[PDB]
Design a protein around this ligand. Structure first.
Ligand SMILES: *[C@@H]1O[C@H](CO)[C@@H](O[C@@H]2O[C@H](CO)[C@@H](O[C@@H]3O[C@H](CO)[C@@H](O)[C@H](O)[C@@H]3O)[C@H](O)[C@H]2NC(C)=O)[C@H](O)[C@H]1NC(C)=O
Ligand code: CA
Ligand code: ZN
Ligand code: ZN
Length: 783
C-alpha cells in the first residue's frame, strides 16, 4: 500500500489497489504517500556546485549523487554543473546522418513534446526568448505552420494527432459533447471522459502495443510539475531493455493558459514562452546526459493557436431567438444547438440568418458547413452549428479573459507549430504547411509500425524524412472508359430540347486530335469504383460522361492568359443539343427540367470561353448539362464568365477540372445510387449536393500552364448546391460583392474531392508520386 520503489511505475495496479502511476491523481486513487514520495520538491530542479557528489538524500526532488544515472533521476543540468559538460543549446548543430544510439537500443525512440495553444507566430519571437526551441527549429525539419482540425480546441486536436482521424471519425468532436445513444455528456472536468466508450479509432499508443512496441503513459495528471514529467521520461528511458518504452509524450498546459488570460500578443506571453523553452532545454540536456541526443526523434507540436477575444465581443442568442429557454447551446468560439427536451430547427436557423448588419456568426445545418471542415458525420455533432467570427464569442443569454480559440481551422490565429528533430528527420530543412491529420502515419513510420486506417495521405509527408519506410503507389483504375464514336443520327432523339451545316462537312468532328494534349494536361482522372462511362472529346474541352448519373463525372479544359470572354448570344440562350455519341436512354431530357419548377440547368464547360463561334455549339451538348438551382446559377455563371478568366490572367493560364458531387449522407464520401435522395422531378437525373473545380497552373508563373517544367500550383473548391443564397448575406448585391467570398469559404484540397467523387487526379505528370500526394493535400486558404 506504499509508493516506495514504485513512483511513476508503468504497470497499472488495481482497482482497487492504490496506484502510483501518471494518472492516479486524476482518479483520486494514489497511495497515501504518493504526494510525499513521488512529488518531491526539495531544493528545486537544478544542481548547484555544492551538491556535486552529495550523499543521496531521498527527499531531494532530483539528485546530484554518483548513483543518479543508474536511475536516471539526476537533475538535468548535473553533468554541466558537476562534470564540465556543455548545455545542448550551446553546442553547434551537427547533422545526424544515422541514429547514434547506445547499448540496448533496438530502434530510435520517439518523444512527442506537445504544447497547448502554441501559435505559429510565437516562433517569430526568436532565440533571445526561446533559444532551445529555435535550435530544434533551425537544425531540424520545420513547417512555417501546421493546420489543426476543427473545432480548434484541445481534446479534438490532441486525439486527431494520436489517431490520424478527423474528429467526426474518432468521436472527440468537442471539449464538451452530448451523445444521444449514451444519453450522457462529456466534459473537460469530471470523470465521464475517462470512460473508454467515448474514444474511437486507434491511437498511437495502442497501435504500438498491438505490434509489440512498448508505449509510455502519454497522459499526465495536471498536478505533476513539468519538471517531474521530464524527469520521469528520462527515468523510463533508463529502464532495462525489456521494460523501456519506445514512444513517449510530454504535454504542457502552456502557453494556452496565459494566452487565455492575456491574449496572444500580450507582453505577459514572453515569460510563459521562456518557461516552455527552459523545459525543452531540460529535456535536451537530459537526453545528452544519457547519450540519446543524437538517437531520439523529437516532435515539437502544438494543438491550436490563440486569438484576441474579450467579454464585450459576445453575441447573445437571446437577442435573436424569442424562445431561448427551449434550446441548449454549447457556447463560445463555436456554437452547437440542440433542444433542451427531446423548438423547430428550420425556424431556429431562419431566425439566426442575416438579422443584423454586423452579425458576428453564421448558422448552418451541419451538412452545409464547408466540406474541408469534415464536421458532420457523427451523432455527437448537433444538426445546428454556428460558425463564429474570429475575435468573437456566442453565448445563450446575458474582463478576466483576453484570449480564446476554437474558430475555423483556416483562420491565421488558429495555426500552430511543428518541428521534427533527430536522426530520421531531415537536417536544416523547411517544408510547406501541412495538416495535423498527417502526423500519425509519420509517427508510425518513425516507430516501424503499420498505421491503422486513417485520414492522412500516406506518403504526402515523405519529404520530412531522411529515410522512408513507405513508398506510395498510385491506385489501379477500376473502371475503364468507353470511347464512343459518332454512332447515332439526329432524328433518333426526342429529348424535348431545341436549338436553332458545317458539322456535316467535318468528318474528324469529336475525334481525339489535339484535345488530350491541350485540355488534359495531367492525364485522364482514373475512376476508382465500378461504373460505366464515356470519354468525350471536343475542340475546347474533354469530359468523362457517366451513363449512370447522366452527366459528366469530370470536365477538363485549359484557358490561356490571352483567352477572350464572349456572351451566350440571345439566339442560343435556351439551346440544348443532342449528343450523337451517346444513346437517348443514357441522356438527360429537357422536358424534366420544364416539369421541375424549382430546378434549372447549367454547363460544366462554359459557353463563355469557347474558342470560336463554331466551337461554342459544343458547349450546348446535352452531355455538358448539369442540374442547377436558379440561386446557384448566379454563383456558377459568375465563376464561369468572370472568375475563370481572372484566374487565367493572374496565373499565366489555368487548367480547370469541374464536376458534380453527391454526398447526401454527409460522410465525405461518394454516394452510391441507393444513397441519392433527390432527382430532377419525374426523372432519373440525380441532383448534386455540390459542384467542384480544381484549378491548376505552373508554380513558376513565368511559364504558361500548358508548358510547365516543374512543380504545379493548385486551388480547388467544393461549392454547396443550394436553392438559395442565404449563406451569403450580401447576395442581393451584384455578384462581384459576394460570390468570390463564398467560394473562398468553400476552398478544398484535391484529396477532399477524390474522396467525394471516387476519382484519382494527376496520374500523368513529370513529378514524383510523393510530390503529387503533397499537392493533393494542399489547401489554398486566402489568409
Ligand atoms: C477517415 O478515415 C476513416 C478510417 O479509414 C474512414 O472511416 C471508415 O470508413 C469506412 C468506409 O465507410 C468504414 O468501413 C466500412 O466497413 C464496413 C464493414 O465493416 C462496410 O460497410 C464497408 O464496405 C467498409 O469496409 C469504416 O467503418 C470507417 N472506419 C472508421 C474508424 O471510422 C473515413 O471514411 C475517413 N473519412 C474521409 C472523409 O475520408
Ligand atoms: Ca456519401
Ligand atoms: Zn489547447
Ligand atoms: Zn485553451
Amino acid at each position: 500500500g506504499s509508493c516506495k520503489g514504485r513512483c511513476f511505475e508503468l504497470q497499472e495496479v488495481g482497482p482497487p489497489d492504490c496506484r502510483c502511476d501518471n494518472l492516479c491523481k486524476s482518479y483520486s486513487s494514489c497511495c497515501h504517500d504518493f504526494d510525499e514520495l513521488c512529488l518531491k520538491t526539495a531544493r528545486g530542479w537544478e544542481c548547484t556546485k555544492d551538491r556535486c557528489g552529495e550523499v543521496r538524500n531521498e527527499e531531494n526532488a532530483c539528485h546530484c549523487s554518483e548513483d543518479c544515472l543508474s536511475r536516471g533521476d539526476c537533475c538535468t543540468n548535473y553533468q554541466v554543473v558537476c562534470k564540465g559538460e556543455s548545455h545542448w543549446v550551446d553546442d553547434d548543430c551537427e547533422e545526424i546522418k544515422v541514429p547514434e544510439c547506445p547499448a540496448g537500443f533496438v530502434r530510435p525512440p520517439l518523444i512527442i513534446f506537445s504544447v497547448d495553444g502554441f501559435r505559429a507566430s510565437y516562433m517569430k519571437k526568436g532565440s533571445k526568448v526561446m533559444p532551445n526551441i529555435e535550435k530544434l527549429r533551425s537544425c531540424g525539419t520545420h513547417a512555417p505552420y501546421m493546420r489543426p482540425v476543427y473545432p480548434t480546441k484541445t481534446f479534438p486536436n490532441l486525439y486527431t494527432l494520436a489517431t490520424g482521424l478527423y474528429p467526426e471519425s474518432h468521436g472527440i468532436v468537442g471539449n464538451s459533447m452530448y451523445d444521444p445513444v449514451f444519453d450522457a455528456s462529456f466534459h473537460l472536468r469530471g470523470r465521464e471522459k475517462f470512460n473508454h466508450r467515448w474514444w474511437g479509432g486507434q491511437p498511437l499508443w495502442i497501435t504500438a502495443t498491438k505490434q509489440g512496441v512498448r508505449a509510455g503513459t502519454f497522459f499526465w495528471s495536471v498536478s505533476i510539475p513539468h519538471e517531474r514529467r521530464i524527469l520521469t521520461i528520462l527515468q523510463w528511458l533508463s529502464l532495462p531493455d525489456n521494460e523501456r518504452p519506445s514512444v513517449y509524450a510530454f504535454y504542457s498546459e502552456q502557453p494556452d493558459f496565459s494566452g487565455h488570460k492575456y491574449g496572444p500578443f500580450g507582453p505577459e506571453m514572453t515569460n510563459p514562452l521562456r518557461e516552455i523553452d527552459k523545459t525543452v532545454g531540460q529535456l535536451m540536456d537530459g537526453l545528452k546526459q544519457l547519450r540519446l541526443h543524437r538517437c531520439v526523434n523529437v516532435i515539437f507540436v502544438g494543438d491550436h493557436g490563440m486569438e484576441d477575444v474579450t467579454c464585450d465581443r459576445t453575441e447573445f442568442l437571446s437577442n435573436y431567438l424569442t424562445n431561448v429557454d427551449d434550446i441548449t447551446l454549447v457556447p463560445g468560439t463555436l456554437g452547437r444547438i440542440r433542444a433542451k427536451s427531446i423548438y423547430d430547427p428550420k425556424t431556429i436557423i431562419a431566425a439566426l440568418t442575416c438579422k443584423k448588419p454586423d452579425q458576428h456568426f453564421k448558422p448552418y445545418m451541419k451538412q452545409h458547413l464547408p466540406k474541408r471542415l469534415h464536421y458532420a458525420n457523427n451523432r455527437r455533432i448537433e444538426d445546428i452549428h454556428l460558425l463564429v467570427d474570429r475575435r468573437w464569442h456566442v453565448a445563450r443569454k446575458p474582463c478576466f479573459f483576453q484570449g480564446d480559440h476554437g474558430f475555423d481551422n483556416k483562420v491565421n490565429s488558429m495555426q500552430t507549430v511543428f518541428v521534427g528533430y533527430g536522426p530520421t528527420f531531415k537536417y536544416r530543412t523547411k517544408v510547406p504547411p501541412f495538416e495535423n491529420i498527417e502526423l500519425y502515419n509519420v509517427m508510425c513510420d518513425l516507430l516501424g509500425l503499420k498505421p491503422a486506417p486513417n485520414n492522412g495521405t500516406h506518403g504526402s509527408l515523405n519529404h520530412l524524412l531522411r529515410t522512408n519506410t513507405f513508398r506510395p503507389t498510385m491506385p489501379d483504375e477500376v473502371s475503364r472508359p468507353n470511347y464512343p464514336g459518332i454512332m447515332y443520327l439526329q432524328s433518333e432523339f426526342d429529348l424535348g430540347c431545341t436549338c436553332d451545316k458545317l458539322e456535316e462537312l467535318n468528318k474528324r468532328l469529336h475525334t481525339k486530335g489535339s484535345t488530350k494534349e491541350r485540355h488534359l494536361l495531367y492525364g485522364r482522372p482514373a475512376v476508382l469504383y465500378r461504373t460505366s462511362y464515356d470519354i468525350l472529346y471536343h475542340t475546347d474541352f474533354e469530359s468523362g460522361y457517366s451513363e449512370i448519373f447522366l452527366m459528366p463525372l469530370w470536365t477538363s479544359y485549359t484557358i490561356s492568359k490571352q483567352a477572350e470572354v464572349s456572351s451566350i448570344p440571345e439566339h442560343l440562350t435556351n439551346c440544348v443539343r443532342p449528343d450523337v455519341r451517346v444513346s437517348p436512354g443514357f441522356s438527360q431530357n429537357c422536358l424534366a427540367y420544364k416539369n421541375d419548377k424549382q430546378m434549372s440547368y447549367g454547363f460544366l464547360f462554359p459557353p463563355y470561353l469557347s474558342s470560336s463561334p463554331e466551337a461554342k455549339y459544343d458547349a450546348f451538348l446535352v452531355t455538358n448539362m448539369v442540374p442547377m438551382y436558379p440561386a446557384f446559377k448566379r454563383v456558377w455563371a459568375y465563376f464561369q464568365r468572370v472568375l475563370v478568366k481572372k484566374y487565367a490572367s493572374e496565373r499565366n493560364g489555368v487548367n480547370v477540372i469541374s464536376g458534380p458531387i453527391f454526398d447526401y449522407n454527409y460522410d465525405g464520401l461518394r454516394d452510391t445510387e441507393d444513397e441519392i435522395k433527390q432527382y430532377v422531378e419525374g426523372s432519373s437525373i440525380p441532383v448534386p449536393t455540390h459542384y467542384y473545380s480544381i484549378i491548376t497552373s505552373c508554380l513558376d508563373f513565368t511559364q504558361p500552364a500548358d508548358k510547365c517544367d516543374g512543380p504545379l500550383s493548385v486551388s480547388s473548391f467544393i461549392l454547396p448546391h443550394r436553392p438559395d443564397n442565404d449563406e451569403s448575406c450580401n447576395s442581393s448585391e451584384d455578384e462581384s460583392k459576394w460570390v468570390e467570398e463564398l467560394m473562398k469559404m468553400h476552398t478544398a484540397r484535391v484529396r477532399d474531392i477524390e474522396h467525394l467523387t471516387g476519382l484519382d487526379f494527376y496520374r500523368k505528370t513529370s513529378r514524383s508520386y510523393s510530390e503529387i500526394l503533397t499537392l493533393k493535400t494542399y489547401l489554398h486558404t486566402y489568409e
